[PDB]
Amino acid sequence: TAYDVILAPVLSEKAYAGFAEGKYTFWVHPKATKTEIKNAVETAFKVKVVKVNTLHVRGKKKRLGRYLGKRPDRKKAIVQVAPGQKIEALEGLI
Amino acid sequence: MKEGIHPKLVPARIICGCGNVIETYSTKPEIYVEVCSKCHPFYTGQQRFVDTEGRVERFQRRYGDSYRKGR
Amino acid sequence: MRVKMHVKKGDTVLVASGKYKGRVGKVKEVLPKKYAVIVEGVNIVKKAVRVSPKYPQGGFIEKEAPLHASKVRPICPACGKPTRVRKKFLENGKKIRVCAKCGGALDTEE
Amino acid sequence: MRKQLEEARKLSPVELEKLVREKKRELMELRFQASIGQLSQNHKIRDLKRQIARLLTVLNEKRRQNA
RNA sequence: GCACAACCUGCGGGAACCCGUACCGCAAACCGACACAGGUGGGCGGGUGCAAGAGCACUCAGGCGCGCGGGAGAACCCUCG
RNA sequence: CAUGAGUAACGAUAAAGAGGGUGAGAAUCCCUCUCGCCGUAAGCCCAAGGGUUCCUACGCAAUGGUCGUCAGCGUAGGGUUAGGCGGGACCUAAGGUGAAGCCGAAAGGCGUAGCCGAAGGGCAGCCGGUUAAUAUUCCGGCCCUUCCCGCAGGUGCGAUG
RNA sequence: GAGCCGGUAGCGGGCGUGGAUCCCUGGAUGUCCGAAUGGGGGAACCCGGCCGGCGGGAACGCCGGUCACCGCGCUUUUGCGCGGGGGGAACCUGGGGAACUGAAACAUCUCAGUACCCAGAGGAGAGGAAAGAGAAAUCGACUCCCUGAGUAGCGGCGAGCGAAAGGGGACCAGCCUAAACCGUCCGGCUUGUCCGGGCGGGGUCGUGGGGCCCUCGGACACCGAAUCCCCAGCCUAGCCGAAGCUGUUGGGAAGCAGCGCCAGAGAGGGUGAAAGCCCCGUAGGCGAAAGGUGGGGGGAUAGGUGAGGGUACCCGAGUACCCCGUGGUUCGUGGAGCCAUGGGGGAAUCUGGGCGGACCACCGCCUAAGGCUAAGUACUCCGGGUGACCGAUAGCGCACCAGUACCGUGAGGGAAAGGUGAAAAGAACCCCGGGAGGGGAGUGAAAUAGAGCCUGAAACCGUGGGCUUACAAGCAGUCAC
């Protein structure tokens, strides 16, 4: 309770280009306030929170032998930089 | 509840009927009237000390009001 | 054959079997006594995968089932297992003692 | 790391505070890892979580003792 | 209270979160237990011609070709001359 | 599990014919070329309601009223983000609730006030460009919105009765 | 006691005899909904006001601690400090309370105070020390069982319905308060001498209590948890624990055979086909803990009980009682009693007053119009065990991803499917093929044991073989040949 962390980067393709020049996209604690995004963002990666937007998605179509389901809840949020800093290794990475 | 008495309980039941008589007169009982009903008292009031009421119910009333009249 | 057991890594005999030739009990569960005596398996003529040689057929088959194995063997083979008399300050020593004896002392061998 | 049980015993207010916080961050590191080293990681994840968990068990014990 | 730091008004600076879009959607995805010709709300409804016009006939864009095929084609119900 | 039955039936008399292609197999998939029927709809559009699916990639034994290398089918992965669009962060009627109050054998009946409660009120952006895929949400050009800190100028300012 | 990262075994990585898996008892956050209560709201999601915090400060926004309502008593000013509420298969008390069907119609009647709506206390409540019984100069709380008669009786005396004291049994504490009188006291009004409310002695058990006079009196009684300490019964973990091998037919043996074996423990299951001596911490007996629960046995804690006569009396209920209007009860209207209440009347302090006999004269009875609770019959969610109780269409419907699929708007209805084998060794590999699937090799004791795969029959369709059949009218057949 108060363990700041609240996310998992958007290893997502399309989301790549943004990482590429100025914005970055990730999966975030389905719940964090957008200002929550700004803070986790800022103190976490020592940056400059710019433009913080959000989207959400649940799962559809998972057949399980004799019964079925479709998954849980994956949350999406995108935040941009001010200069183009931080996330380096992550980005060079994927 | 919202209409029993105030000075005890007098709010309820009643099964009854009749038909007719003619017994130790000339015969048996013209027997029958499978009926059901209510059965109760009345309302009224006085004053604590400038500004009041009572509400209550009938008799129990009269004696009572007399009582707290004593105080 | 329950939440409780017989020998463990131990080293014991096969009565009603096909081998009897006792030896290293490579592993033994808690509930299904499921124990492998490394005494009779097969090949599972493997996947056809490169999992096993790209030209496969697994070798060491050894899941030991039946429980007629005569666990424990001191200078004596088929023997039940005793318990204790403690003898020393805080002494469980549920070692195995009957006729000959074996307790699997933490030394020279299991 | 019963030993860690010990360190635990050892620290207090702001201490345990930033300890569990930073450690937590560490596990974040893990979160990140969700697609890199991985293999020997496993444990950093499960255990690390158990660890920090303890961290909290303690804070509770101590400040609870308090108020 | 204000009135010396309340409101009206410029410039600078700084802020602004929660849930929402995909696509189907006069319809095989919405309602009739079916890829059921039934019903289901508002937006000009392109054009030519017709006195007028969302009716008429051919079309603009845009949309199809209904989803089981080929075959001779007599009875006879259907539809129509 | 049989039976009429391998006859009745394929969901609209808005017709289709070719060439080449891909395929284990293509009347029934793909391009392209002839051709008919819509067009005032078989248009697009917002909304409702559906809630997968949409896409991209593999696959078809089930499913389509046979096909079927096609799919809204199966398997996997990715896909919608908006101070200014919408709704709440505001308003309220019918209307529900309901502190009061009147009221029932009990459970309730009735109910001002305040509240909840609407494509009925009110409110600050538009257009051109970019994805397999979403847009006035993204990019860009252009036009603003209130609220906070300040400062600068200006005032009996200061309810929501 | 030495192995585990639940049902997944697989991948990819691990912790542990410096008690790791895990069995138990108490621990910590303990998301959002749900009584919800800070507010709203189509619950499980959106709002807000106070102190703390961090960040880009203010605005933003999260952790956080935060803030219904009720009635309840306390300092009228804490509105501080409590209570409840919300449940629950059946049992349970009271509240309100029905047609069928019977009476072969059916209106009294009947099912019945039964079904059901409700409110509510529990772990069990219910009732529970007599204005009782009953008539013997008798009993003695209440509750539940057997009996009491299905008589005594209730009634279109019809269908029907149907007691109670006693006796046998079981389980056996009894205890209390306003009850003006005492005095005390504070408030009173208004002052003297009334009421009001606190302490008491009185605080009626089968009848006194108080105040005056005298005999009085100087250690055994515990509660309904008064209360506390214990062997706390268990909770779930514990522990031991009886005796065979050789052979042998078998894929097997625990089986046929040989000899040797146990037994305060031949209950059963489990170990490749039927073991006392093989598996089982069982019957044998014993085991055990610092938590969560108490009856016992005993202690202490023991409120409070526990004397005698005398004397003008004042001291348990606001309605007893009587008229009609009604409930109970074996009572349905009746000669109809007692308790019980809706109307109007409308009082007695132990010469008191209801009760036995409608009522009157008797004797007798009990002591009413307040309070408390144990113990013996009920009930079944949940645990344990036993079954001339069931085998997968019976059993709970439900034997295991059945109260879910799926129909209905909601209310609501409400399936099916158990087994491959002994163990996975469950199918490398070669061959037709797009695939499935098909022939081989290996499996093996069998694979006509092959994955819906044990035993696997009837029905129906199929491949081959025998007899039979184109001038035939007949369920069928069937006797004959």
UniProtKB/Swiss-Prot annotation, chain A:
Subunit details: Part of the 50S ribosomal subunit. Contacts protein L29, and trigger factor when it is bound to the ribosome.
Name of the molecule in the record: Large ribosomal subunit protein uL23
Name of the gene encoding the protein in the UniProt record: rplW
GO MF term set: rRNA binding; structural constituent of ribosome
GO cellular component, one term: ribosome
Annotated GO biological process: translation
Family under the similarity heading: Belongs to the universal ribosomal protein uL23 family.
Job description of the protein: One of the early assembly proteins it binds 23S rRNA. One of the proteins that surrounds the polypeptide exit tunnel on the outside of the ribosome. Forms the main docking site for trigger factor binding to the ribosome.
Matching SUPFAM superfamilies: Ribosomal proteins S24e, L23 and L15e (SSF54189)
Gene3D superfamilies per UniProt: 3.30.70.330
Organism: Thermus thermophilus (strain ATCC BAA-163 / DSM 7039 / HB27)
Keywords tagged on the record: Ribonucleoprotein, Ribosomal protein, RNA-binding, rRNA-binding
Swiss-Prot record, chain B:
TM spans (from-to): none
Positions with a binding annotation for Zn(2+): 16, 18, 36, 39
Short name of one Pfam family: Ribosomal_L31
Family matches, as PROSITE patterns: RIBOSOMAL_L31
Highest taxon in the source lineage: Bacteria
SUPFAM superfamilies documented for this protein: L28p-like
Manner of cofactor binding, per the entry note: Binds 1 zinc ion per subunit.
Cellular component GO terms held in the UniProt record: ribonucleoprotein complex; ribosome
Entry annotated with the keyword RNA-binding: yes
Function: Binds the 23S rRNA.
Protein name: Large ribosomal subunit protein bL31
UniProt source species: Thermus thermophilus (strain ATCC BAA-163 / DSM 7039 / HB27)
Gene it is expressed from: rpmE
Swiss-Prot record, chain C:
Molecular-function GO terms, alphabetical: rRNA binding; structural constituent of ribosome
UniProt entry keywords in alphabetical sequence: Ribonucleoprotein, Ribosomal protein, RNA-binding, rRNA-binding
Alphabetized InterPro entries for the sequence: KOW, Rib_uL2_dom2, Ribosomal_uL24, Ribosomal_uL24_CS, Ribosomal_uL24_KOW, Translation_prot_SH3-like_sf
GO biological process: translation
SMART domains: KOW
Gene3D superfamilies: 2.30.30.30
Disulfide pattern: none
GO CC annotation: ribonucleoprotein complex; ribosome
Protein origin, superkingdom: Bacteria
Classification via SUPFAM superfamilies: Translation proteins SH3-like domain
Residues in the signal sequence: none
Keyword field contains Nuclease: no
Family stated for the protein in its record: Belongs to the universal ribosomal protein uL24 family.
Subunit structure: Part of the 50S ribosomal subunit.
Protein's job: One of two assembly initiator proteins, it binds directly to the 5'-end of the 23S rRNA, where it nucleates assembly of the 50S subunit.
Protein name: Large ribosomal subunit protein uL24
Organism of derivation: Thermus thermophilus (strain ATCC BAA-163 / DSM 7039 / HB27)
From Swiss-Prot, chain D:
Keyword Metal-binding: no
UniProt keyword terms in alphabetical order: Ribonucleoprotein, Ribosomal protein
Molecular function as annotated in GO: structural constituent of ribosome
Bilayer-spanning residue ranges: none
GO cellular component: cytosolic large ribosomal subunit
GO biological process: translation
Pfam families found in the cross-reference section: Ribosomal_L29
Assigned protein family: Belongs to the universal ribosomal protein uL29 family.
The protein's name in its UniProt record: Large ribosomal subunit protein uL29
Protein source organism: Thermus thermophilus
